[PDB]
Design a protein around this ligand. Structure first.
Ligand SMILES: Cc1cc2nc3c(=O)[nH]c(=O)nc-3n(C[C@H](O)[C@H](O)[C@H](O)COP(=O)(O)O)c2cc1C
Ligand code: SF4
Lengths: 129, 62, 432
């Protein structure tokens, strides 16, 4: 594997001091591991297949001159993507960020049938086409 | 009532097309009041009656 | 052994003996003409026997399709499942060029009633729903008069003809829609909703009117069914080519000297039928420009092909068209073929139920394109564009009305592209 006097470093990996993140933005933040919900406006599920990690929204005030959305939170527009939940939580613990993982919701398999639209005894018989 | 009897029980809406036709014969054309009266006498939502009236050509809505 | 020139059907072997109302159309005249005779024996023989003899007769669907009537009817020989079983006779008759059904209803209604009886017994149906179109008010009233006569005579109703069978023949009237001729659209029209056709992952043998199993047949086939039982399957099999047996009511119109309706045997020469029964094309056979064989759905065919074409399903299929409903529409050299086909497309646009996208949007687009074509307001590329649009419509609609509207365009292009090109060139030179 690696023959260089391969050393046991069992204790968990932590690069909190090797990222440059200031004091404030490393424990008072709370990342959120979640599979994004499908935009109910559309009907495509291609945006609900990758886990995402995001940071809590902070103060967003209005600029006195023109009215922009001024903010002082550097980790506001930064959202990471991950193939699996375990990798995302590994990244969260590696960088020392508090998390709250939400399980991936999956559409329950329905039971569609064209014939039920024109049933004879049941109430699923449609009154229009 | 004879026309309704000419259909299976529980599917009275099948009489919508002839019943509406009757409303034509005694009125020439089909006023919206006739539409609602057909819906009432056939226990059918008025929208379905409006749909079948606007779809078929012989029904004179004017 | 085997007949070669299938034609010149004899008067003795004709299913309908009262085409033109020359005999009493009530029960008395029908019994005088062999109708309603020995029906009890057919009723008691067994549904399997009737279905088998229908298969032996080789009867194909005489309503526009070509499905074997025996197989379609035997699709209902399944055991009971609590739900009632229903036979429905389509009498919409909305396809242009069709005139047979009206004639049989208003001249031989008792044949139709006996057909519903024998068919319902064969398929185990409890009642019949003859869906006549709204316009045929006089025809519907005549049919119901014959129904009342049969009911009084005891042929139908409780203990039909004394065989212990209980059958009813309701006649539901249409409300002026050509799409109601479609069997699933007819089913919903009977059910009270609009005449939008239903998709067919489920079939009428499983789910039909009111959800109960239903089978839609045509007026002609059910009318000939009791005659098929009486005379015999082999007697029907003798007439017409193989797999194309039986006799058909050909409705001849257009630019024919004497447009009419005749009961002629299948696979008949088109030229011979036009000359004898119809009287030939106005101005002789040389004055013939085009022939629409079986109504608007079937693509037109040019005179060169019309010279020698048998009138069976397969022969016209080889001729890049269809038998359809045997609606002969002849157009002479004084006919604007573009105008006639555009009128047919306008009819289809006015009759589209609008359910599925290809028929709702495509057919209107073809109507606009053909309207521009009639005035030659286009360029040669839009002919291929129209062909592509017609192909996109084909095989993509819920019912067959989309294909029945696309086929005339394909036939017109395939056989008269130079006419469209020259008309377009004339319009281009005039607009200078
Ligand atoms: C647009 C459209 C119109 C039709 N109109 C009729 C009609 O007027 N009469 C008819 O018998 N069949 C008509 N048919 C055919 C029926 O849908 C069905 O295939 C047929 O009635 C079944 O009986 P058959 O096998 O004896 O033809 C039509 C089909 C389509 C797609
Ligand atoms: S093809 Fe036309 S008539 Fe048939 S279902 Fe589609 S829209 Fe309706």
């Amino acid at each position: 594997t690696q023959d260089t006097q391969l050393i046991a470093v069992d204790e968990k990996l932590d690069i909190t001091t090797l990222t440059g993140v200031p004091e404030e933005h490393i424990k008072t933040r709370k990342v959120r591991i979640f599979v994004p919900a499908r935009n109910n406006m559309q009907s495509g599920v291609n945006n609900t297949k990758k886990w995402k990690m995001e940071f809590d929204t902070r103060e967003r005030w209005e600029n006195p001159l023109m009215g922009w959305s001024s903010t002082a939170d550097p980790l506001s527009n930064l959202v990471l993507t991950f193939s699996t939940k375990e990798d995302a939580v590994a990244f969260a613990e590696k960088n020392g960020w508090s998390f709250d993982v939400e399980e991936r919701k999956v559409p329950k398999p329905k039971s569609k049938s064209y014939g039920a639209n024109f049933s004879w005894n049941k109430r699923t018989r449609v009154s229009t086409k | 009532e004879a026309i309704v009897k000419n259909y299976p029980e529980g599917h009275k809406a099948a009489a919508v097309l002839p019943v509406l036709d009757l409303a034509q014969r005694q009125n020439g054309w089909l006023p919206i009041s006739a539409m609602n009266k057909v819906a009432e006498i056939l226990q059918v939502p008025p929208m379905r009656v409006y749909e079948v009236a606007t779809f078929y050509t012989m029904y004179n809505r004017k | 052994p085997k007949k070669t020139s299938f034609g010149s059907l004899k008067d003795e072997d004709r299913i309908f003996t009262n085409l033109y109302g020359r005999h009493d159309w009530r029960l008395k005249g029908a019994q005088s003409r062999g109708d309603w005779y020995k029906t009890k024996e057919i009723l008691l023989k067994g549904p399997d026997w009737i279905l088998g003899e229908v298969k032996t007769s080789g009867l194909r669907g005489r309503g526009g399709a070509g499905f074997p009537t025996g197989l379609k009817w035997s699709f209902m020989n399944k055991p009971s499942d609590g739900r009632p079983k229903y036979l429905v006779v389509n009498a919409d008759e909305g396809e242009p060029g069709t005139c047979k059904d009206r004639e049989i209803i208003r001249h031989d209604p008792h044949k139709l009633v006996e057909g519903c009886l024998v068919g319902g017994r064969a398929m185990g149906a409890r009642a019949a729903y003859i869906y006549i179109r709204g316009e045929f008010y006089n025809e519907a009233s005549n049919l119901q008069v014959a129904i009342r006569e049969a009911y009084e005579a005891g042929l139908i109703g409780k203990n039909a003809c004394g065989s212990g069978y209980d059958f009813d023949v309701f006649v539901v009237r249409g409300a002026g829609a050509y799409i109601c001729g479609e069997e699933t659209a007819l089913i919903e029209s009977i059910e009270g909703k609009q005449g939008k056709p239903r998709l067919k992952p489920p079939f009428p043998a499983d789910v039909g009117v009111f959800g109960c199993p239903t089978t839609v047949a045509n007026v002609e086939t059910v009318a000939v069914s009791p005659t098929i039982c009486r005379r015999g399957g082999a007697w029907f099999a003798s007439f017409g080519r193989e797999r194309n047996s039986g006799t058909k009511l050909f409705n001849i119109s257009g630019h024919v000297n004497h447009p009419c309706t005749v009961e002629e045997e299948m696979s008949v020469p088109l030229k011979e039928l036009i000359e004898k029964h119809a009287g030939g094309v106005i101005g002789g056979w040389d004055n013939l420009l085009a022939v629409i064989p079986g109504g608007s759905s079937t693509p037109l065919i040019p005179k060169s092909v019309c010279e020698t074409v048998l009138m069976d399903f397969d022969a016209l299929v080889q001729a890049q068209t269809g038998l359809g409903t045997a609606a002969v529409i002849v157009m002479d050299r004084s006919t604007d073929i573009v105008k006639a086909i555009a009128r047919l497309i306008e009819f289809y646009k006015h009759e589209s139920c609008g359910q599925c996208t290809p028929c709702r949007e495509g057919v209107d687009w073809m109507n606009k394109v053909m309207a521009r074509f009639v005035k030659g307001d286009a360029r040669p590329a839009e002919i291929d564009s129209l062909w592509e649009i017609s192909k996109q419509i084909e095989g993509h609609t819920i019912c067959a009305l989309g294909d029945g509207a696309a086929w005339p365009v394909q036939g017109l292009i395939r056989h008269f592209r130079p006419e469209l090109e020259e008309r377009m060139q004339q319009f281009a030179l005039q607009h200078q």
